[PDB]
Design a protein around this motif. Structure first.
Motif, mmCIF file in Angstrom:
data_model
loop_
_atom_site.group_PDB
_atom_site.id
_atom_site.type_symbol
_atom_site.label_atom_id
_atom_site.label_comp_id
_atom_site.label_asym_id
_atom_site.label_seq_id
_atom_site.Cartn_x
_atom_site.Cartn_y
_atom_site.Cartn_z
ATOM 1 N N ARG A 106 52.737 -40.589 5.394
ATOM 2 C CA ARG A 106 51.979 -40.372 6.624
ATOM 3 C C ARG A 106 50.670 -41.159 6.755
ATOM 4 N NH1 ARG A 106 48.514 -35.581 9.472
ATOM 5 N NH2 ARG A 106 49.032 -36.089 11.656
ATOM 6 N N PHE A 107 49.872 -41.195 5.709
ATOM 7 C CA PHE A 107 48.560 -41.784 5.883
ATOM 8 C C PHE A 107 48.304 -43.085 5.121
ATOM 9 C CE2 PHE A 107 46.901 -37.865 7.836
ATOM 10 C CZ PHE A 107 46.125 -38.455 8.819
ATOM 11 N N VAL B 44 47.905 -33.249 30.192
ATOM 12 C CA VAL B 44 48.217 -31.823 30.135
ATOM 13 C C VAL B 44 48.891 -31.409 31.434
ATOM 14 C CG1 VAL B 44 45.828 -31.435 30.829
ATOM 15 C CG2 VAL B 44 47.210 -29.479 30.141
ATOM 16 N N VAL C 294 39.928 -35.262 25.212
ATOM 17 C CA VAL C 294 40.153 -35.040 23.787
ATOM 18 C C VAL C 294 39.217 -35.943 23.023
ATOM 19 C CG1 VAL C 294 42.538 -34.260 23.687
ATOM 20 C CG2 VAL C 294 42.007 -36.678 24.134
ATOM 21 N N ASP C 295 38.830 -35.537 21.821
ATOM 22 C CA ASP C 295 38.140 -36.438 20.916
ATOM 23 C C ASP C 295 39.231 -37.033 20.050
ATOM 24 O OD1 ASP C 295 36.735 -33.584 21.145
ATOM 25 O OD2 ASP C 295 35.147 -35.124 21.232
ATOM 26 N N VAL C 296 39.298 -38.358 19.956
ATOM 27 C CA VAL C 296 40.389 -39.014 19.212
ATOM 28 C C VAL C 296 40.096 -39.276 17.734
ATOM 29 C CG1 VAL C 296 40.019 -40.625 21.135
ATOM 30 C CG2 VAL C 296 40.874 -41.512 18.933
ATOM 31 N N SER C 297 41.124 -39.118 16.903
ATOM 32 C CA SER C 297 41.032 -39.332 15.456
ATOM 33 C C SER C 297 40.373 -40.650 15.049
ATOM 34 C CB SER C 297 42.430 -39.263 14.827
ATOM 35 O OG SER C 297 42.956 -40.553 14.555
ATOM 36 N N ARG D 274 43.547 -43.110 14.732
ATOM 37 C CA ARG D 274 43.914 -43.589 16.046
ATOM 38 C C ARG D 274 42.893 -44.606 16.543
ATOM 39 N NH1 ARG D 274 45.052 -42.986 21.436
ATOM 40 N NH2 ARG D 274 47.268 -43.558 21.685
ATOM 41 N N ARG D 275 41.613 -44.385 16.262
ATOM 42 C CA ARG D 275 40.590 -45.326 16.703
ATOM 43 C C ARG D 275 40.760 -46.722 16.093
ATOM 44 N NH1 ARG D 275 34.735 -44.316 16.102
ATOM 45 N NH2 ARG D 275 34.982 -42.445 14.785
ATOM 46 N N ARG E 18 49.409 -27.845 16.273
ATOM 47 C CA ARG E 18 49.598 -28.744 17.389
ATOM 48 C C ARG E 18 49.520 -27.934 18.688
ATOM 49 N NH1 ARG E 18 51.464 -33.855 14.271
ATOM 50 N NH2 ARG E 18 49.587 -33.535 12.973
ATOM 51 N N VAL F 94 48.816 -33.133 20.178
ATOM 52 C CA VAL F 94 47.424 -32.741 20.112
ATOM 53 C C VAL F 94 47.295 -31.857 18.855
ATOM 54 C CG1 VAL F 94 45.958 -31.019 21.295
ATOM 55 C CG2 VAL F 94 46.649 -33.093 22.507
ATOM 56 N N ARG G 109 37.548 -28.549 18.153
ATOM 57 C CA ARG G 109 37.909 -29.629 19.078
ATOM 58 C C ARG G 109 39.409 -29.915 19.106
ATOM 59 N NH1 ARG G 109 33.671 -32.304 20.473
ATOM 60 N NH2 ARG G 109 34.827 -31.935 22.419
ATOM 61 N N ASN G 110 39.801 -30.725 20.080
ATOM 62 C CA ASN G 110 41.172 -31.196 20.184
ATOM 63 C C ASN G 110 41.311 -32.713 19.992
ATOM 64 O OD1 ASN G 110 42.346 -28.727 20.398
ATOM 65 N ND2 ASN G 110 42.598 -28.772 22.637
ATOM 66 N N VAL G 111 42.121 -33.103 19.009
ATOM 67 C CA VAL G 111 42.259 -34.504 18.620
ATOM 68 C C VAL G 111 43.096 -35.326 19.588
ATOM 69 C CG1 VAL G 111 42.339 -33.619 16.284
ATOM 70 C CG2 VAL G 111 44.431 -34.446 17.383
ATOM 71 N N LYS G 112 43.325 -36.580 19.228
ATOM 72 C CA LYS G 112 44.310 -37.390 19.919
ATOM 73 C C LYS G 112 45.159 -38.167 18.895
ATOM 74 C CE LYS G 112 45.689 -40.421 23.393
ATOM 75 N NZ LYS G 112 46.518 -40.159 24.604
ATOM 76 N N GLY G 113 44.587 -38.448 17.727
ATOM 77 C CA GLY G 113 45.336 -39.144 16.699
ATOM 78 C C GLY G 113 45.888 -38.213 15.639
ATOM 79 N N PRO G 114 46.499 -38.789 14.589
ATOM 80 C CA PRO G 114 46.930 -38.074 13.381
ATOM 81 C C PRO G 114 45.684 -37.648 12.590
ATOM 82 C CG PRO G 114 48.014 -40.219 13.624
ATOM 83 C CD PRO G 114 46.839 -40.218 14.523
ATOM 84 N N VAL G 115 45.641 -36.440 12.032
ATOM 85 C CA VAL G 115 44.405 -35.996 11.384
ATOM 86 C C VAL G 115 44.627 -35.140 10.132
ATOM 87 C CG1 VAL G 115 42.390 -34.495 11.700
ATOM 88 C CG2 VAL G 115 42.841 -36.260 13.340
ATOM 89 N N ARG G 116 43.737 -35.334 9.156
ATOM 90 C CA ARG G 116 43.787 -34.618 7.892
ATOM 91 C C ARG G 116 42.462 -33.912 7.558
ATOM 92 N NH1 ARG G 116 43.157 -40.239 4.590
ATOM 93 N NH2 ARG G 116 45.094 -39.783 3.446
ATOM 94 N N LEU H 297 35.003 -36.975 13.118
ATOM 95 C CA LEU H 297 35.101 -37.131 14.556
ATOM 96 C C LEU H 297 33.736 -37.373 15.181
ATOM 97 C CD1 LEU H 297 37.944 -36.905 15.352
ATOM 98 C CD2 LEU H 297 37.475 -34.759 16.537
ATOM 99 N N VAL H 298 33.719 -38.251 16.177
ATOM 100 C CA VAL H 298 32.530 -38.472 16.977
ATOM 101 C C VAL H 298 32.643 -37.618 18.222
ATOM 102 C CG1 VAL H 298 31.092 -40.157 18.168
ATOM 103 C CG2 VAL H 298 32.472 -40.859 16.196
ATOM 104 N N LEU H 299 32.146 -36.389 18.137
ATOM 105 C CA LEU H 299 32.050 -35.544 19.313
ATOM 106 C C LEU H 299 31.160 -36.303 20.289
ATOM 107 C CD1 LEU H 299 31.071 -32.195 17.434
ATOM 108 C CD2 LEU H 299 33.308 -33.350 17.475
ATOM 109 N N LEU I 73 46.524 -25.704 25.416
ATOM 110 C CA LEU I 73 46.896 -26.945 26.110
ATOM 111 C C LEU I 73 48.380 -26.932 26.503
ATOM 112 C CD1 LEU I 73 45.255 -30.266 24.798
ATOM 113 C CD2 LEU I 73 45.232 -29.261 27.072
#
Ligand SMILES: [Mg+2]
Ligand SMILES: [Mg+2]
Ligand SMILES: [Mg+2]
Ligand SMILES: [Mg+2]
Ligand SMILES: [Mg+2]
Ligand SMILES: [Mg+2]
Ligand SMILES: [Mg+2]
Ligand SMILES: [Mg+2]
Ligand SMILES: [Mg+2]
Ligand SMILES: [Mg+2]
Ligand SMILES: [Mg+2]
Ligand SMILES: [Mg+2]
Ligand SMILES: [Mg+2]
Ligand SMILES: [Mg+2]
Ligand SMILES: [Mg+2]
Ligand SMILES: [Mg+2]
Ligand SMILES: [Mg+2]
Ligand SMILES: [Mg+2]
Ligand SMILES: [Mg+2]
Ligand SMILES: [Mg+2]
Ligand SMILES: [Mg+2]
Ligand SMILES: [Mg+2]
Ligand SMILES: [Mg+2]
Ligand SMILES: [Mg+2]
Ligand SMILES: [Mg+2]
Ligand SMILES: [Mg+2]
Ligand SMILES: [Mg+2]
Ligand SMILES: [Mg+2]
Ligand SMILES: [Mg+2]
Ligand SMILES: [Mg+2]
Ligand SMILES: [Mg+2]
Ligand SMILES: [Mg+2]
Ligand SMILES: [Mg+2]
Lengths: 80, 206, 70, 60, 143, 141, 67, 145, 55, 63
Positions: free
Chosen positions: B62-63, B130, B141-144, B147-148, J14, J21, J38-45, J50-52, J62
């Motif tokens: 995965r990562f 949504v 959404v705040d993105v990973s 992903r960034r 999710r 998400v 918060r709610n992501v957009k990418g894959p996360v561990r 995160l930059v709020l 959602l």
RNA sequence: UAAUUGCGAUAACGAACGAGACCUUAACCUACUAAAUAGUGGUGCUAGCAUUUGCUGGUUAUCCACUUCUUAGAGGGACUAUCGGUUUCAAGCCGAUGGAAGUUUGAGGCAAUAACAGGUCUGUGAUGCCCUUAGACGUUCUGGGCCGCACGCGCGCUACACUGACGGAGCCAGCGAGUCUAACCUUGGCCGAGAGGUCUUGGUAAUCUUGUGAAACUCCGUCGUGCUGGGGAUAGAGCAUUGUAAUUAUUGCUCUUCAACGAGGAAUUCCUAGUAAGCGCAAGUCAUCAGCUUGCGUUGAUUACGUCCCUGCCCUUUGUACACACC
């Protein structure tokens, strides 16, 4: 001439012989038997010849226009 | 550096940089830092590499994608649009050239410049479709970080390719143009634009 | 058709007095300086290296690259 | 390895399924220096159904 | 130190030998050169125009040095590439046996290769000689 | 007879055999110096082991390699593997263990498989597509 | 998904049932044991069996296990 | 090659074989905008004429152009093979021509006419505005005429 | 014959091109019958005696 | 402009109809002792950063 | 869990078909048995370059030894092992190390019960019944036709170029296959621009074609953004090959002609690792014809490792006046 030779040879029990038992059904039916009598008999005889299991399918048409099939199994078989 | 030789001999700069520092085509991996906290961990740099080619098993988990050296990620993302699928030797060379070019303009480890345009392009937040009922609004959404980085590379190379299409400027030149314009973010790059807009709409819908 | 396929003497001198400040020179840059198409611009690349300005720092087909002399 | 690769259907209808049979052919050779007697003995016997035994001679 | 051609990279060698065979003036150039193609699989004739027969000569020679024996067939197969059959898929195609055969006959008359037994064409001992020589020369420009 | 080992390297279907004997320090591939090689971009990939482990190292030894199979990139990875494997195989029979293990260390550490063969291989196509996973194309009606 | 079929789990049960002394949280020897001590027809299935009976032992060591 | 010069010398656009030819193209290809001079033909003719193909249509002496034409319309004399030619073995006088320029149109007319006049299927087929080389006509070319 | 074929106007391409295209060109599959597939047309039927004699 | 950095401390699951998400509890960095979801957009561990973009506001469901 | 795969819960206990096991193929064995139809080192005979040893070849037997590489028999190997997280501390799942290998090791073969008026009477000297049977619906012979072209639909091939076309040069696979009462796979020599021709030749094959020197690819040049040197449709003339026969042009070659196509609306296919995509090859068909298939190796990524939103399907619960079962 003589560079080829044929011998006959009885088979150790026709009982575990798919080919023999098929030919036997062929004959049972052809010799004007019953359907279940023929099949159940072949089966009971194969079983009696000490098999682990056996199965006889009759497909096609008997006496009524519409076709039918029938499974006649006893004992134990594996399939895959 | 103490030279040494035997039968079939090994060239000067070759011996030189080889045994000493462990640097790129011939650019420094030391120095070179990720000017945005986070992104470190998702932009490689060290372990250092000679050229951006590797029989890398970076997919089967995965990562572990993260662990692949950044520059090679960039070159990887170069080698698409059907006609070019595969064709890594092509890509790699395009990168060697690109880095030479970027270096010419304003110094900097050009690999540091790359690192900067990557840092400077990943959307800090975005949007998704949504439901909320047929007429679908858009939830911010705040993105990973992952992903960034990903999307940063994607954007950079796309814009660079789309630019480069149908004109005399060559891939490495326009890739370097995008890289440079982006490294210190300048809204003349396709990338920076697209980031800025993603975040514009992402604000607009929270 | 839209131009840059010959040499027009004024053009030559133009090439000699315009090629510093060009930290980057290539086939593409020469065209971009509103002149010489990638035919004769390649010749310009070979012939600024006749002696002077352009310092060869990269190698080949498609990509060439030079910097102002020192 | 002899492959034969055929459609399963005797006709045309159905998703186009393909099937592939093989006959595996294994070949070997043992070189032996001997007189006539032992070759003839050893090769009339050792006979076997399914195994194709060939005895040549010479050095050309 | 001692030398072969295997100690010299393809291009600068074969160009060294091109320029040589060129210079020399002894050769044989059929005459149909310039008016000819190199393979049915090609669109235009060579761009070297005057020459290129020297280029192929060099190439052919070095190819034969680097192995036992080779014939016209193997060279056609070698020197050939993809032919666009226009709008129907590409297929590899052999190059011309004239160009090659004539090239062999040329280098042979110049004693740089010789009809081998086994079949084909083996590099000549005087081929070994002269090739190792210009190989050396090419590393000598590089000094 | 001088000291000598043989090793090999394998990426896809290419295989590269190394003969690593006691010598005055050659490093040749098929029949040319390891300086030629070209692929070229990839050239450093084959230098890679030597520089990872110090250029000296090859002064008590002659090295030769011959690759058949695979294709251009395929052969580069195989030859490099064969060379590093080679050097280590040689320190294992002639030099001392600690040296060998220090070499495995610096290869294995940085790595690119140098000592261990990549198991990736072709998957077979299956009827109904031009590829292994790729299925053909349908229209429904 | 790596879940062990009945025949495997059944066999671990029975073996541990009747050969617990001999057997020992080491697959390598429990394996050889299985060879000397029961009759299986594939290496694979035998290994699978041993490895699971090894697991089962390895956790009996710290409190009982049902079945 | 070399940084060049010249003066008023070269005049852009120039007209040969009743057609026009742009300057500032690499001459070999300039000759192509004439009918009947595919890239090969042009190439060989130029080589035969003793011209520097590195030149544009641009430069070139008047003389040079003259020779170029002479050979273009007398190939067989200036040893050009004849398998190099678009019209070998006429079909009346049986000579070999390389028909050029405004005349290749005529020759097409001529041939098509011969077919039509003789009632030959190929002819009928032409007259009908169909494909003549035997291709299926169910599916292809429907944008058509 | 061939004289006929070239001389016959009402032939060749232009002429077709200028005609309207029928609608059965752009038709659809047809189908005809299917939700009768299970419904036997034979109107005959078997009979429990004949079937029991057979099977 | 006010950036705010937060470390993922727990992965929740999710959301989203499509399901791409991911809900996460983050402990922001420049002053912990306070958590936001918060709610992501990418894959996360666990332990990503995160930059709020806006510091106080948080979601849940959602569709 | 991929699995009625298991744990657990438990009026059930313990089992059998099917899944799994099994088999085949791809991976690992400096352990075993061997090899002039596979190869390595030494030696002789010998070429070239250096010369100071050296370096690079020639030599189906001039001899000696070997089995790392190749071949295929016999074994061995892995059991998700060790350790640790997580879980009802259950079956399991996850991470780390080791490892040829840890996604059912990868990929296949086999594959229960039942169903369908699915397709096949045009594979069969399998077959019922009907039809036909000498002015034949038997059969053969000549010739045409399945290719016919306003146009709708599907699978495809080649493209729109500069990560490119052209031109030299570099130069590397794997799966196959080949001639007896015959003309098959074809090396080599010559002739020919090419296609091809001609004289010989090796092979019923790990022996010869063939290291099948495949193509993408690599490198040095030419071109330079121009429907351009991208693209190669259409068409003209000539030459050869298969065949008793080439017209409606079997196929191959040369010159010439140089179309649309400037990334493709609504839609829609396929795919998770040596995979996708690119690239060629062999085999099937085959006198001749692959833009098709079946396999094969070469170059070799981006992105998920999730969910039920779309779609499809299985499962419970529920209703039934259906049971020929919602046709
Ligand atoms: Mg079973
Ligand atoms: Mg080739
Ligand atoms: Mg080539
Ligand atoms: Mg494949
Ligand atoms: Mg023309
Ligand atoms: Mg299943
Ligand atoms: Mg000495
Ligand atoms: Mg000596
Ligand atoms: Mg062995
Ligand atoms: Mg590991
Ligand atoms: Mg297996
Ligand atoms: Mg049938
Ligand atoms: Mg009938
Ligand atoms: Mg048939
Ligand atoms: Mg039958
Ligand atoms: Mg009939
Ligand atoms: Mg048809
Ligand atoms: Mg349709
Ligand atoms: Mg289909
Ligand atoms: Mg090329
Ligand atoms: Mg001739
Ligand atoms: Mg013979
Ligand atoms: Mg081979
Ligand atoms: Mg255009
Ligand atoms: Mg073209
Ligand atoms: Mg015809
Ligand atoms: Mg017709
Ligand atoms: Mg054009
Ligand atoms: Mg597109
Ligand atoms: Mg045909
Ligand atoms: Mg074929
Ligand atoms: Mg077909
Ligand atoms: Mg009710």
């Amino acid at each position: 001439p003589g560079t080829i030779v044929l011998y006959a040879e009885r088979v150790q029990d026709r009982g575990l012989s798919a080919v023999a038992q098929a030919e036997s059904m062929k004959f049972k039916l052809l010799n004007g038997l019953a359907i279940r009598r023929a099949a159940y008999g072949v089966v009971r005889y194969v079983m009696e010849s000490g098999a682990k299991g056996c199965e006889v399918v009759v497909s096609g048409k008997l006496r009524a226009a519409r076709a039918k099939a029938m499974k006649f199994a006893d004992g134990f078989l594996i399939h895959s | 550096f103490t030279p040494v030789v035997l039968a079939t001999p090994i060239p000067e700069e070759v011996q030189q940089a080889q045994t000493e520092i462990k640097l790129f085509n011939k650019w420094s991996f030391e120095e070179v830092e990720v000017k945005d906290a986070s992104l470190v961990d998702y932009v490689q740099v060290r372990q250092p590499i000679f050229v951006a080619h590797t029989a890398g098993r970076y997919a089967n988990k995965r990562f572990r994608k993260a662990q692949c050296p950044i520059i090679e990620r960039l070159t990887n993302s170069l080698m698409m649009n059907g006609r070019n699928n595969g064709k890594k030797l092509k890509a790699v060379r395009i990168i060697k050239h690109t880095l030479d070019i970027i270096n010419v303009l304003t110094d900097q480890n050009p690999i540091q410049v790359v690192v900067d345009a990557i840092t400077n392009t990943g959307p800090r937040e975005d949007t998704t479709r949504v439901g909320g009922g047929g007429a679908a609004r858009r939830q911010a959404v705040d993105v990973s970080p992952l992903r960034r980085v990903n999307q940063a590379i994607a954007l950079l190379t796309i814009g660079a390719r789309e630019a480069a299409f149908r004109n005399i400027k060559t891939i490495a030149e326009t890739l370097a143009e995008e890289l440079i314009n982006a490294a210190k973010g300048s809204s003349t790059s396709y990338a920076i634009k697209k980031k800025d807009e993603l975040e514009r709409v992402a604000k607009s819908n929270r | 058709a839209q131009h840059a396929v010959i040499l027009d003497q004024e053009k030559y001198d133009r090439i000699l007095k315009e090629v510093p400040t060009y930290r980057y020179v290539s086939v593409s840059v020469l065209v971009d300086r509103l002149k010489i198409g990638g035919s004769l611009a390649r010749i310009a690349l070979r012939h600024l290296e006749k002696e002077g300005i352009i310092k060869p720092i990269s190698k080949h087909s498609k990509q060439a690259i030079y910097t102002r002399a020192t | 390895v002899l492959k034969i690769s055929t459609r399963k259907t005797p006709n045309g209808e159905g998703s186009k399924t393909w099937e592939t049979y093989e006959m595996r052919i294994h070949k070997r050779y043992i070189d032996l220096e001997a007189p006539v007697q032992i070759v003839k003995r050893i090769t009339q016997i050792t006979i076997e159904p399914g195994v194709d035994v060939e005895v040549v001679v010479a050095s050309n | 130190p001692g030398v072969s051609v295997r100690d010299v990279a393809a291009q600068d060698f074969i160009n060294a030998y091109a320029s040589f065979l060129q210079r020399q003036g002894k050769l044989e150039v059929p005459g149909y050169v310039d008016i000819v193609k190199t393979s049915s699989g090609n669109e235009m004739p060579p761009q070297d125009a005057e020459g290129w027969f020297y280029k192929r000569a060099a190439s052919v020679a070095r190819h034969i040095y680097m192995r036992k024996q080779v014939g016209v067939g193997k060279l056609n197969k070698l020197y050939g590439g993809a032919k666009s059959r226009g709008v129907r898929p590409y297929k590899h195609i052999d190059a011309s046996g004239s160009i090659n055969r004539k090239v062999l006959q040329a280098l042979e008359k110049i004693g740089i290769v010789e009809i081998s037994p086994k079949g084909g064409r083996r590099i000549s001992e005087n081929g070994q000689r002269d090739l190792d020589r210009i190989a050396a020369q090419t590393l000598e420009e590089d000094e | 007879a001088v000291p000598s080992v043989q090793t090999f390297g394998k990426k896809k279907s290419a295989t590269a055999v190394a003969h690593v004997k006691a010598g005055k320090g050659l490093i040749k591939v098929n029949g040319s110096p390891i300086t030629l090689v070209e692929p070229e971009i990839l050239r450093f990939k084959v230098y890679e082991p030597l520089l990872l482990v110090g250029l000296d190292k090859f002064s008590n030894i002659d090295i030769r390699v011959r690759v058949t199979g695979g294709g251009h990139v395929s052969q580069v990875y195989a030859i490099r593997q064969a060379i590093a494997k080679g050097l280590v195989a040689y320190h294992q029979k002639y030099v001392d263990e600690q040296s060998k293990n220090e070499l495995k260390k610096a290869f294995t550490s940085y790595d690119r498989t140098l000592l261990i063969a990549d198991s990736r291989r072709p998957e077979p196509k299956k009827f109904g597509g031009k590829g292994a996973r790729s299925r053909f194309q349908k229209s429904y009606r | 998904g790596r879940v062990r079929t009945k025949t495997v789990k059944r066999a671990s049960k029975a073996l541990i049932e009747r050969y617990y002394p001999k057997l020992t949280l080491d697959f390598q020897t429990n394996k050889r044991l299985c060879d000397e001590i029961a009759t299986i027809q594939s290496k694979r299935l035998r290994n699978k069996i041993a490895g699971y009976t090894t697991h089962l032992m390895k956790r009996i060591q710290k409190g009982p296990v049902r079945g | 090659s070399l940084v060049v010069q010249e003066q008023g010398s070269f005049q852009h656009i120039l007209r040969l074989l009743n057609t026009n030819v742009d300057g500032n193209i690499k001459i070999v290809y300039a000759l192509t905008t004439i009918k009947g001079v595919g890239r090969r033909y042009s190439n060989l003719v130029c080589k035969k004429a003793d011209v520097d193909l590195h030149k544009r249509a641009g430069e070139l002496t008047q003389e040079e152009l003259e020779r170029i034409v002479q050979i273009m319309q007398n190939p067989t004399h200036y040893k050009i093979p004849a398998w190099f030619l678009n019209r070998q073995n006429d079909i009346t006088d049986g000579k070999d021509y390389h028909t050029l320029a405004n005349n290749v149109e005529s020759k097409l007319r001529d041939d098509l006419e011969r077919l039509k006049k003789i009632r030959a299927h190929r002819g009928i087929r032409h007259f009908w505005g169909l494909r003549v080389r035997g291709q299926h006509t169910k599916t292809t070319g429907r944008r058509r005429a | 014959g061939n004289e006929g074929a070239i001389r016959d106007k009402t032939a060749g391409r232009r002429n077709n091109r200028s005609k309207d295209v029928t609608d059965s060109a752009t038709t659809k599959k047809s189908n005809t019958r299917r939700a009768t597939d299970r419904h036997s047309r034979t109107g005959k039927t078997d009979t429990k005696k004949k079937v029991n004699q057979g099977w | 402009t006010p950036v705010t950095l937060a470390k993922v401390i727990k992965v929740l699951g999710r959301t989203g109809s499509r399901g791409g998400v991911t809900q996460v509890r983050v402990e922001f960095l420049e002053d912990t002792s306070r958590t936001i979801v918060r709610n992501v957009k990418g894959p996360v561990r666990e332990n990503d950063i995160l930059v709020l973009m806006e510091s106080e506001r948080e979601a849940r469901r959602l569709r």
